[PDB]
Every structure is written in structure tokens, then in C-alpha cells.
């Protein structure tokens, strides 16, 4: 089975996670036929007849778009590998700014930059596309593995299923399931919203109930909830469940609903918006490009 991989506007994390299979990577490579992979081999061109493709990253520049279109024609099955390819990822945040702003900062206004001419690289480099777009927005995607990056075992499971001829199935529940933190039997109730530095969290109680914006509730399980287990809220790196299109919108809905529920009729509704100074960066960290409103006008 000829499998091929490539990367776009990502960080390479998904590929590193593929390598995080360790001993099993060799076992996997004896079952598949790796025909193209820029990080491991020198095969420059995407070959014809590719059964499965693992495309990492979203569409950040013009070359990314070409490659997506090229791999889509050469591959029978295309897989949006990771959160950046599936939902847009962290780079997506750049959608809050124009490309001109993004480029002027990196090549002009930076304190250590010395550009007297005031030029932006344009020779031999591709132009940036209007906004970071998930892979599904430019090409037909057959399957996807969510996670920033997806855990190794999950990547094996998906690839393994395709090799067997079966259809890959992703976990459907939200993170609280895997999460070991104790939940109140009466239900969730939030009193005050605290920033990650405000306070000393209790290691046993649910972080959302303690007043910290934990995205586990609006995030697909699979990762094993390492963030709350380590003492920090989930940032929603895996993205939403199959029944949720926009993760941030849903995360807010939930957060607002339970805020001051024990004083539901008389709690001030202006406490929450005044408390959260940066809303987009709190709920659309890894999914802004896949949101209904994925840019700032």
C-alpha cells in the first residue's frame, strides 16, 4: 500500500508524533510503502498512484494550495493530518490581522529588524493566501485525524484501518470522559472566571467548576486529557466533536449557561464579558479558520 505524506502551513508536530510511534514505526513501515515524505526521504516530486496521503497543516500560502491540488489528484484517499489541516490550527489566529500586517511586523517593525528599503520578500517565494483555510476548504478530504498533534496510537489506528480495508472511526465523546478530575453530582456551577495565573488550583476538583476556562467540555476526547491531569485547563487542541461545527461558539454557550447558575435570576450578565479580555484567543485557539466567522474584518 503506497502511502505518502506532506506538510503545508503547520509546524511539523504531526510528523514528529508519527515518529513518536517509536518501535512501532518500523513495524508500520514494513507494512506500508512510503513513496514520498519530505522530512524522511529525498523523493522531491509527488509520485503518481498513491493509495493514502497524510497531509499536515492548513492552507497558508499559494504553494500549499498547489500541493493540496496536486496530492489530491495523485492520492486515492486524502487525510487531513492533525488540527492545523483539519481545522486551521494556531496559525489560523493570523486571520485576525491582514497579511500586510503579518508581513510588515516580521520584516519591518520588529525591534531587531533593519530594513531601510522597507521591502517584503516577493522573489521565488509564494504569496500568502487571503486567510488560513482548513484543507477541506480547498480539496475533497476523505478522513481526518484531529489533535495538535494527534497521539501516536491514534495515528496508527487510522492508518491500520485503511490498510485492512476497514473504515476508520474516531472517538465521539467530549474530554470529561477520559478526564480523571472529580465532577460534582449536582452538576457544574461557575462563580467567578479566573485567569490561569490567578490562584492555586485544587488537583482533584474539575477545573471548570473552579472558574478556569477548560475546553475539555467542547473538545473531542482521545488524547487522555493530559492538561487537566497536569494542572492546567484544556485548550481544546483536539477540536470539536462530530456533532459540533464551531468549537468556540459552543464553548461560550456552555460557559455562559453555568456562570452564576446558583444565582441564575439575579447574577449580573456583564461580569463574564468584562472578565474575559481576549475572547477569540480563549475559545478559538486552534479552530478560528473552521469557525463560522473565521476572520476579523
Amino acid at each position: 500500500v503506497k502511502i505518502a505524506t506532506t506538510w503545508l502551513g503547520g509546524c511539523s508536530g504531526c510528523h514528529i508524533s508519527l515518529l513518536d510511534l517509536h518501535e512501532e514505526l518500523l513495524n508500520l513501515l514494513e507494512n506500508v510503502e512510503l513513496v514520498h515524505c519530505p522530512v524522511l526521504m529525498d523523493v522531491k516530486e509527488i509520485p503518481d498512484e498513491v493509495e493514502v496521503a497524510l497531509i499536515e497543516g492548513g492552507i497558508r500560502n499559494e504553494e500549499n494550495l498547489e500541493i493540496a491540488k496536486e496530492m489530491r489528484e495523485r492520492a486515492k484517499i486524502v487525510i487531513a493530518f492533525g488540527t492545523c489541516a483539519a481545522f486551521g490550527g494556531v496559525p489560523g489566529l493570523g486571520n485576525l490581522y491582514s497579511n500586510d500586517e503579518l508581513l510588515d511586523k516580521a520584516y519591518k517593525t520588529t525591534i531587531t529588524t533593519k530594513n531601510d528599503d522597507g521591502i517584503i520578500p516577493n522573489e521565488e517565494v509564494p504569496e500568502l493566501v487571503s486567510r488560513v483555510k482548513p484543507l477541506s476548504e480547498v480539496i475533497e478530504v476523505d478522513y481526518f485525524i484531529p489533535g495538535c498533534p494527534p497521539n501516536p496510537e491514534m495515528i496508527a489506528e487510522v492508518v491500520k484501518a485503511l490498510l485492512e480495508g476497514k473504515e476508520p472511526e474516531l472517538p465521539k465523546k467530549n474530554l470529561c470522559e477520559e478526564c480523571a478530575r472529580k465532577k460534582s453530582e449536582e452538576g457544574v456551577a461557575i462563580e467567578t472566571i479566573k485567569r490561569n495565573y490567578e490562584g492555586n488550583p485544587d488537583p482533584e476538583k474539575c477545573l471548570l467548576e473552579q472558574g478556569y476556562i477548560c475546553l475539555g467540555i467542547a473538545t473531542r476526547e482521545g488524547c487522555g486529557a493530559p492538561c487537566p491531569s497536569s494542572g492546567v485547563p484544556c485548550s481544546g487542541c483536539s477540536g470539536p466533536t462530530d456533532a459540533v461545527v464551531d468549537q468556540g461558539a459552543k464553548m461560550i454557550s456552555a460557559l455562559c449557561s453555568d456562570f452564576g447558575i446558583d444565582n441564575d435570576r439575579d447574577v449580573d450578565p456583564m461580569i463574564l464579558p468584562k472578565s474575559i479580555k481576549d475572547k477569540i484567543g480563549s475559545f478559538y485557539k486552534f479552530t478560528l479558520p473552521s469557525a463560522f466567522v473565521p476572520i476579523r474584518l
Partner: protein, 138 residues
């Protein structure tokens, strides 16, 4: 030439009733809004609001029972907490806070709904069209 595209969300027991009251009484208002029925204002959440904007909405309206008159007792308190965050989130997304409007209209408040529809249209008409769909299709 250009006429705003507004979408409405109305609770079955109060605003949808108020909307019906305005119709019976022949209380004329602008033909921009297209109302969607829900049983409670609590059924409305950020996703439906953002979805509307993505689709091309120049305005989004949400109606419900007055605070304390919810047919379902406390559904509108949850929506009230949601809409306050949303208002500011829309600003962060470059969408004017004024393009989203939420009111509490009862089943018989047909005169209030008529006037709320007149005002909101005048506000969205002044603001001009929302260029989100224009930029996404690019």
C-alpha cells in the same frame, strides 16, 4: 438598491406570539427579517448567531419572554448570559455589536415588535452591508 438581510429567532410563547399579534393588527414594518421559530429563547446560542453572519446576514435578532415571564421559567436567563459575551466576541471579530439585537417581547406586544423591527432595520441600514461573506468568498 441594497436591502439588509436580517434573520430572526423567536420563542413560540412570547416573541413569535408578539410577531403574530403585529400581523393580525396590520402593524407594518420592514421586509428584511425572516423569523425562525424556537420554543424558548434558551434554544438560541452563539453557534446559530455566528452561522447566520457567515451565511450573509447584515443583522441578527433574538426575541424572548421578559425576564421572569419565561414560559419555561428560567430559559431566558441562560440566553441573556450568552448574548452579553457574544456581543463583545462579535466586536473582536470586527462585527459591529449593533448588528446583533436582543429584546424581551411578550405574546401580546405587537406594537413593541413592530417598533423594534423598524428601529433595528434603520440601524442595520445605516451601518450598511456586512462584508464577511464578501471576504470569505474571495
Amino acid at each position: 438598491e441594497w436591502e439588509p438581510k436580517i434573520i430572526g429567532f423567536c420563542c413560540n410563547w412570547c416573541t413569535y406570539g408578539g410577531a403574530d399579534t403585529a400581523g393580525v393588527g396590520r402593524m407594518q414594518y420592514p421586509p428584511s427579517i425572516r423569523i425562525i421559530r424556537v420554543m424558548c429563547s434558551g434554544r438560541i446560542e452563539p453557534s446559530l448567531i455566528l452561522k447566520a453572519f457567515k451565511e450573509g446576514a447584515d443583522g441578527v435578532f433574538v426575541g424572548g419572554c421578559h425576564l421572569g415571564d419565561c414560559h419555561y421559567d428560567s430559559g431566558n436567563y441562560k440566553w441573556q448570559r450568552r448574548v452579553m459575551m457574544l456581543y463583545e466576541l462579535l466586536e473582536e471579530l470586527g462585527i459591529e455589536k449593533e448588528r446583533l439585537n436582543h429584546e424581551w417581547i411578550s405574546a401580546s406586544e405587537g406594537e413593541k415588535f413592530q417598533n423594534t423591527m423598524k428601529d433595528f432595520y434603520n440601524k442595520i441600514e445605516a451601518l450598511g452591508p456586512c462584508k464577511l461573506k464578501e471576504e470569505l468568498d474571495k
